[PDB]
Design a binder for this molecule. Structure first.
Ligand SMILES: [Zn+2]
Ligand SMILES: [Zn+2]
Ligand SMILES: [Zn+2]
Ligand SMILES: [Zn+2]
Lengths: 162, 162
DNA sequence: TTGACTCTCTTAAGAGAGTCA
DNA sequence: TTGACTCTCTTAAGAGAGTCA
Protein backbone atom coordinates (compact mmCIF):
# COMPACT_ATOMS: atom_id res chain seq x y z
CA UNK A 1 0.00 0.00 0.00
CA UNK A 2 0.99 3.64 -0.33
CA UNK A 3 -2.12 5.81 -0.11
CA UNK A 4 -3.92 6.17 3.22
CA UNK A 5 -6.98 4.57 1.59
CA UNK A 6 -4.89 1.58 0.52
CA UNK A 7 -3.43 1.19 4.01
CA UNK A 8 -6.96 1.29 5.41
CA UNK A 9 -7.85 -1.57 3.08
CA UNK A 10 -4.80 -3.49 4.31
CA UNK A 11 -5.89 -2.89 7.93
CA UNK A 12 -9.46 -4.00 7.14
CA UNK A 13 -8.34 -7.28 5.56
CA UNK A 14 -6.01 -7.90 8.50
CA UNK A 15 -8.84 -7.41 11.02
CA UNK A 16 -11.07 -9.66 8.92
CA UNK A 17 -8.51 -12.49 9.00
CA UNK A 18 -7.46 -12.08 12.63
CA UNK A 19 -11.12 -11.87 13.64
CA UNK A 20 -11.41 -15.52 12.67
CA UNK A 21 -8.41 -16.62 14.78
CA UNK A 22 -9.48 -18.85 17.69
CA UNK A 23 -10.77 -16.52 20.45
CA UNK A 24 -9.52 -17.70 23.84
CA UNK A 25 -10.94 -16.55 27.18
CA UNK A 26 -8.35 -15.87 29.87
CA UNK A 27 -8.92 -14.99 33.52
CA UNK A 28 -6.34 -12.45 34.61
CA UNK A 29 -5.36 -10.41 37.68
CA UNK A 30 -6.23 -6.71 37.42
CA UNK A 31 -4.52 -5.71 40.65
CA UNK A 32 -6.15 -5.03 44.01
CA UNK A 33 -7.03 -8.70 44.43
CA UNK A 34 -9.51 -8.32 41.57
CA UNK A 35 -9.84 -10.77 38.66
CA UNK A 36 -10.86 -9.97 35.10
CA UNK A 37 -11.49 -11.55 31.73
CA UNK A 38 -9.56 -10.97 28.50
CA UNK A 39 -10.47 -12.42 25.07
CA UNK A 40 -7.45 -13.15 22.91
CA UNK A 41 -7.53 -13.78 19.17
CA UNK A 42 -4.58 -16.17 18.92
CA UNK A 43 -2.54 -17.04 15.84
CA UNK A 44 -2.17 -20.85 15.39
CA UNK A 45 0.90 -22.63 16.78
CA UNK A 46 1.81 -23.89 13.30
CA UNK A 47 0.99 -23.35 9.60
CA UNK A 48 -1.39 -22.43 8.20
CA UNK A 49 -1.84 -19.26 10.27
CA UNK A 50 -4.25 -17.29 8.13
CA UNK A 51 -4.44 -15.44 4.84
CA UNK A 52 -1.36 -13.24 4.60
CA UNK A 53 0.44 -14.61 7.68
CA UNK A 54 3.85 -16.30 7.94
CA UNK A 55 6.12 -17.11 10.88
CA UNK A 56 9.60 -15.58 10.82
CA UNK A 57 10.54 -16.55 14.37
CA UNK A 58 9.52 -18.78 17.34
CA UNK A 59 7.08 -16.03 18.37
CA UNK A 60 7.41 -13.57 15.48
CA UNK A 61 5.01 -13.26 12.55
CA UNK A 62 4.61 -11.06 9.49
CA UNK A 63 1.63 -9.99 7.41
CA UNK A 64 2.06 -9.72 3.64
CA UNK A 65 -0.12 -8.25 0.85
CA UNK A 66 0.62 -7.60 -2.85
CA UNK A 67 -1.10 -4.39 -3.89
CA UNK A 68 -0.11 -3.48 -7.45
CA UNK A 69 2.41 -6.18 -8.27
CA UNK A 70 4.68 -5.07 -5.44
CA UNK A 71 4.93 -7.14 -2.26
CA UNK A 72 4.45 -5.44 1.12
CA UNK A 73 5.37 -6.95 4.48
CA UNK A 74 4.72 -5.72 8.02
CA UNK A 75 5.32 -7.22 11.43
CA UNK A 76 2.22 -9.16 12.53
CA UNK A 77 1.12 -6.80 15.32
CA UNK A 78 2.10 -3.52 13.62
CA UNK A 79 -0.74 -3.40 11.06
CA UNK A 80 -3.30 -1.58 13.25
CA UNK A 81 -0.87 1.29 13.67
CA UNK A 82 0.11 1.78 10.03
CA UNK A 83 -1.55 5.22 10.01
CA UNK A 84 0.09 6.51 13.22
CA UNK A 85 3.52 8.08 13.83
CA UNK A 86 6.21 5.37 13.91
CA UNK A 87 8.45 7.06 16.49
CA UNK A 88 8.07 9.30 19.57
CA UNK A 89 10.71 11.19 21.60
CA UNK A 90 13.29 9.80 19.19
CA UNK A 91 12.24 6.23 19.93
CA UNK A 92 10.81 3.62 17.59
CA UNK A 93 7.17 2.69 18.22
CA UNK A 94 6.49 -0.98 18.94
CA UNK A 95 3.37 -3.14 19.24
CA UNK A 96 2.78 -3.58 22.96
CA UNK A 97 0.52 -6.46 24.04
CA UNK A 98 -1.71 -5.13 26.82
CA UNK A 99 -2.72 -8.75 27.41
CA UNK A 100 0.88 -10.06 27.47
CA UNK A 101 0.00 -12.87 25.07
CA UNK A 102 2.38 -12.88 22.10
CA UNK A 103 0.19 -15.04 19.87
CA UNK A 104 -2.73 -12.67 20.34
CA UNK A 105 -3.43 -10.24 17.51
CA UNK A 106 -6.61 -8.70 18.93
CA UNK A 107 -6.01 -4.97 18.23
CA UNK A 108 -8.08 -4.07 21.29
CA UNK A 109 -5.20 -5.69 23.17
CA UNK A 110 -2.32 -3.70 21.62
CA UNK A 111 -0.96 -0.19 21.79
CA UNK A 112 1.83 1.65 19.94
CA UNK A 113 4.69 2.90 22.13
CA UNK A 114 8.44 2.77 22.72
CA UNK A 115 10.19 -0.47 23.72
CA UNK A 116 10.84 0.86 27.23
CA UNK A 117 7.18 1.74 27.82
CA UNK A 118 6.30 -1.59 26.25
CA UNK A 119 8.58 -3.68 28.53
CA UNK A 120 7.64 -1.82 31.69
CA UNK A 121 4.02 -2.97 31.57
CA UNK A 122 5.37 -6.38 32.56
CA UNK A 123 5.76 -5.00 36.08
CA UNK A 124 2.69 -2.77 36.35
CA UNK A 125 0.28 -3.32 39.30
CA UNK A 126 -2.68 -3.32 36.91
CA UNK A 127 -5.72 -1.11 36.17
CA UNK A 128 -7.02 -1.94 39.65
CA UNK A 129 -3.71 -1.91 41.50
CA UNK A 130 -2.30 1.53 40.80
CA UNK A 131 -1.44 1.55 37.08
CA UNK A 132 -0.45 5.10 36.08
CA UNK A 133 -0.02 4.50 32.33
CA UNK A 134 -1.96 7.14 30.33
CA UNK A 135 -3.12 4.40 27.96
CA UNK A 136 -4.20 2.16 30.84
CA UNK A 137 -3.21 -1.48 31.28
CA UNK A 138 -5.79 -4.23 30.72
CA UNK A 139 -4.31 -6.43 33.43
CA UNK A 140 -1.68 -6.56 36.15
CA UNK A 141 1.66 -7.53 34.61
CA UNK A 142 3.04 -11.09 34.81
CA UNK A 143 6.21 -9.94 36.53
CA UNK A 144 4.65 -7.64 39.14
CA UNK A 145 5.35 -8.84 42.67
CA UNK A 146 7.85 -9.07 45.56
CA UNK A 147 10.38 -10.68 43.27
CA UNK A 148 12.79 -13.47 44.15
CA UNK A 149 16.02 -11.76 45.14
CA UNK A 150 18.77 -14.18 46.21
CA UNK A 151 20.96 -11.70 48.10
CA UNK A 152 20.39 -8.08 49.08
CA UNK A 153 22.73 -5.12 49.65
CA UNK A 154 25.57 -6.25 51.94
CA UNK A 155 29.19 -5.59 52.90
CA UNK A 156 31.79 -7.64 54.81
CA UNK A 157 33.60 -4.64 56.25
CA UNK A 158 32.73 -0.99 56.81
CA UNK A 159 34.21 0.75 53.75
CA UNK A 160 30.72 1.73 52.61
CA UNK A 161 27.66 3.73 53.46
CA UNK A 162 24.30 3.83 51.62
CA UNK B 1 39.34 -18.90 43.51
CA UNK B 2 38.16 -22.31 44.68
CA UNK B 3 38.06 -22.28 48.49
CA UNK B 4 35.74 -20.30 50.78
CA UNK B 5 38.66 -18.50 52.43
CA UNK B 6 40.06 -17.63 49.00
CA UNK B 7 36.68 -16.25 47.91
CA UNK B 8 36.31 -14.13 51.05
CA UNK B 9 39.78 -12.70 50.42
CA UNK B 10 38.61 -11.70 46.91
CA UNK B 11 35.51 -9.99 48.31
CA UNK B 12 37.68 -8.21 50.88
CA UNK B 13 40.26 -6.81 48.44
CA UNK B 14 37.45 -5.90 46.04
CA UNK B 15 35.62 -3.93 48.75
CA UNK B 16 38.85 -2.24 49.78
CA UNK B 17 39.72 -0.75 46.38
CA UNK B 18 36.08 -0.03 45.46
CA UNK B 19 35.85 1.59 48.89
CA UNK B 20 38.41 4.01 47.42
CA UNK B 21 36.41 4.94 44.28
CA UNK B 22 35.32 8.60 44.29
CA UNK B 23 32.07 8.96 46.28
CA UNK B 24 29.34 10.97 44.54
CA UNK B 25 26.15 12.08 46.27
CA UNK B 26 22.95 11.62 44.28
CA UNK B 27 19.57 13.04 45.27
CA UNK B 28 16.87 10.76 43.92
CA UNK B 29 13.08 10.45 43.76
CA UNK B 30 11.75 7.99 46.35
CA UNK B 31 8.16 8.13 45.17
CA UNK B 32 5.25 9.68 47.03
CA UNK B 33 6.81 13.03 46.17
CA UNK B 34 9.72 12.42 48.55
CA UNK B 35 13.45 12.72 47.83
CA UNK B 36 16.40 10.75 49.18
CA UNK B 37 20.18 10.77 49.13
CA UNK B 38 22.38 7.95 47.79
CA UNK B 39 26.16 7.65 47.99
CA UNK B 40 27.61 5.92 44.95
CA UNK B 41 31.19 4.67 44.80
CA UNK B 42 31.75 5.22 41.10
CA UNK B 43 34.47 3.59 39.05
CA UNK B 44 36.50 6.21 37.10
CA UNK B 45 35.51 7.06 33.52
CA UNK B 46 38.94 6.07 32.14
CA UNK B 47 42.05 4.16 33.15
CA UNK B 48 43.34 3.71 35.72
CA UNK B 49 40.14 2.39 37.34
CA UNK B 50 41.63 0.64 40.34
CA UNK B 51 43.74 -2.34 41.27
CA UNK B 52 42.28 -5.37 39.50
CA UNK B 53 39.71 -3.51 37.40
CA UNK B 54 39.60 -3.26 33.62
CA UNK B 55 36.90 -1.96 31.26
CA UNK B 56 35.56 -4.53 28.80
CA UNK B 57 32.71 -2.36 27.49
CA UNK B 58 31.25 1.19 27.51
CA UNK B 59 29.58 0.45 30.87
CA UNK B 60 31.03 -2.99 31.65
CA UNK B 61 34.03 -3.81 33.84
CA UNK B 62 35.75 -6.94 35.08
CA UNK B 63 37.58 -7.62 38.35
CA UNK B 64 40.72 -9.73 38.01
CA UNK B 65 42.83 -11.53 40.65
CA UNK B 66 45.83 -13.89 40.40
CA UNK B 67 45.26 -16.52 43.08
CA UNK B 68 47.56 -19.52 42.70
CA UNK B 69 49.56 -18.21 39.76
CA UNK B 70 46.28 -18.75 37.91
CA UNK B 71 44.23 -15.62 37.06
CA UNK B 72 40.52 -15.45 37.89
CA UNK B 73 38.07 -12.95 36.43
CA UNK B 74 34.53 -11.87 37.29
CA UNK B 75 32.13 -9.14 36.17
CA UNK B 76 33.00 -6.16 38.40
CA UNK B 77 29.55 -6.00 40.05
CA UNK B 78 29.32 -9.74 40.75
CA UNK B 79 32.15 -10.10 43.29
CA UNK B 80 30.03 -9.28 46.39
CA UNK B 81 27.89 -12.34 45.69
CA UNK B 82 30.53 -14.96 44.89
CA UNK B 83 29.28 -17.13 47.77
CA UNK B 84 25.58 -17.03 46.80
CA UNK B 85 23.74 -19.39 44.38
CA UNK B 86 24.37 -18.34 40.75
CA UNK B 87 20.81 -19.04 39.61
CA UNK B 88 17.28 -19.00 40.99
CA UNK B 89 14.49 -21.21 39.63
CA UNK B 90 16.74 -21.81 36.63
CA UNK B 91 17.42 -18.12 35.96
CA UNK B 92 20.92 -16.64 35.99
CA UNK B 93 21.49 -14.38 38.98
CA UNK B 94 22.41 -10.83 38.09
CA UNK B 95 24.02 -7.86 39.85
CA UNK B 96 21.10 -5.43 40.15
CA UNK B 97 22.00 -1.74 40.73
CA UNK B 98 19.42 -0.47 43.20
CA UNK B 99 20.74 3.00 42.39
CA UNK B 100 20.39 2.68 38.60
CA UNK B 101 23.93 3.99 38.30
CA UNK B 102 26.02 1.66 36.12
CA UNK B 103 29.39 3.05 37.25
CA UNK B 104 28.55 2.54 40.93
CA UNK B 105 30.10 -0.46 42.66
CA UNK B 106 28.83 0.24 46.19
CA UNK B 107 27.67 -3.20 47.45
CA UNK B 108 25.06 -1.44 49.56
CA UNK B 109 23.46 -0.38 46.27
CA UNK B 110 23.58 -3.88 44.76
CA UNK B 111 21.45 -7.00 44.92
CA UNK B 112 21.66 -10.48 43.32
CA UNK B 113 18.54 -11.46 41.33
CA UNK B 114 17.17 -12.62 37.96
CA UNK B 115 17.50 -10.27 34.95
CA UNK B 116 13.71 -9.92 34.97
CA UNK B 117 13.68 -8.71 38.62
CA UNK B 118 16.66 -6.58 37.71
CA UNK B 119 15.01 -4.82 34.75
CA UNK B 120 11.66 -4.40 36.51
CA UNK B 121 13.16 -1.98 39.00
CA UNK B 122 13.40 0.61 36.21
CA UNK B 123 9.62 0.97 36.47
CA UNK B 124 9.12 0.63 40.23
CA UNK B 125 7.16 3.42 41.97
CA UNK B 126 9.79 3.45 44.74
CA UNK B 127 10.34 2.83 48.50
CA UNK B 128 7.90 5.66 49.24
CA UNK B 129 5.63 5.21 46.23
CA UNK B 130 4.38 1.65 46.60
CA UNK B 131 7.42 -0.55 45.96
CA UNK B 132 6.62 -4.16 46.87
CA UNK B 133 10.02 -5.74 46.11
CA UNK B 134 10.97 -8.11 48.96
CA UNK B 135 14.43 -6.56 48.83
CA UNK B 136 13.23 -2.95 48.75
CA UNK B 137 14.20 -0.43 46.08
CA UNK B 138 16.47 2.47 47.04
CA UNK B 139 14.71 4.83 44.68
CA UNK B 140 11.74 5.25 42.37
CA UNK B 141 13.14 3.97 39.08
CA UNK B 142 14.12 6.09 36.04
CA UNK B 143 11.30 4.79 33.85
CA UNK B 144 8.32 4.99 36.20
CA UNK B 145 5.60 7.22 34.80
CA UNK B 146 2.60 7.57 32.48
CA UNK B 147 4.61 6.70 29.37
CA UNK B 148 4.26 8.25 25.93
CA UNK B 149 1.92 5.95 23.99
CA UNK B 150 1.27 7.16 20.45
CA UNK B 151 -1.83 5.01 19.92
CA UNK B 152 -3.99 2.90 22.19
CA UNK B 153 -6.23 -0.13 21.50
CA UNK B 154 -8.44 0.47 18.48
CA UNK B 155 -10.39 -1.34 15.79
CA UNK B 156 -11.97 -0.17 12.52
CA UNK B 157 -14.76 -2.74 12.29
CA UNK B 158 -16.59 -4.83 14.87
CA UNK B 159 -14.91 -8.24 14.92
CA UNK B 160 -13.23 -7.86 18.32
CA UNK B 161 -14.04 -7.41 22.00
CA UNK B 162 -11.75 -6.80 25.00
C1' DT C 1 0.30 -13.38 -5.64
C1' DT C 2 0.95 -16.67 -1.79
C1' DG C 3 2.45 -19.78 1.84
C1' DA C 4 6.11 -21.72 4.53
C1' DC C 5 10.21 -21.65 5.54
C1' DT C 6 15.13 -19.28 5.94
C1' DC C 7 18.26 -15.48 7.88
C1' DT C 8 20.16 -11.50 11.04
C1' DC C 9 19.04 -7.19 13.63
C1' DT C 10 17.29 -3.67 17.95
C1' DT C 11 17.09 -2.24 22.95
C1' DA C 12 18.92 -2.03 27.52
C1' DA C 13 19.38 -4.34 31.69
C1' DG C 14 23.15 -7.77 32.08
C1' DA C 15 27.56 -11.32 30.80
C1' DG C 16 31.72 -14.35 28.92
C1' DA C 17 36.88 -14.51 27.06
C1' DG C 18 41.14 -13.05 24.07
C1' DT C 19 45.17 -9.93 22.77
C1' DC C 20 49.01 -7.51 24.02
C1' DA C 21 52.38 -4.80 26.91
C1' DT D 1 51.61 -10.20 37.80
C1' DT D 2 48.76 -6.30 36.60
C1' DG D 3 47.05 -3.03 33.24
C1' DA D 4 44.44 -1.62 29.05
C1' DC D 5 42.56 -2.62 25.51
C1' DT D 6 39.86 -6.04 21.93
C1' DC D 7 35.91 -9.26 20.66
C1' DT D 8 31.18 -11.64 21.01
C1' DC D 9 27.17 -13.52 23.93
C1' DT D 10 22.36 -13.51 26.91
C1' DT D 11 17.48 -12.37 27.66
C1' DA D 12 12.88 -10.80 26.53
C1' DA D 13 10.20 -7.28 25.00
C1' DG D 14 10.28 -6.27 19.81
C1' DA D 15 11.94 -5.90 14.29
C1' DG D 16 13.23 -6.22 8.53
C1' DA D 17 14.33 -8.99 4.53
C1' DG D 18 15.58 -13.40 1.24
C1' DT D 19 14.47 -18.04 -1.19
C1' DC D 20 11.51 -21.04 -3.85
C1' DA D 21 7.75 -23.13 -6.29
ZN1 LIG E 1 -4.87 -10.65 23.89
ZN1 LIG F 1 -0.04 0.09 33.65
ZN1 LIG G 1 25.05 3.63 43.68
ZN1 LIG H 1 10.74 -1.72 44.04
Amino acid sequence: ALTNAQILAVIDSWEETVGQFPVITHHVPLGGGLQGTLHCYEIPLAAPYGVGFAKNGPTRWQYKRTINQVVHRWGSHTVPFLLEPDNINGKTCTASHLCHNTRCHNPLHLCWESLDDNKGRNWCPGPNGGCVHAVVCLRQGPLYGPGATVAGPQQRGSHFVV
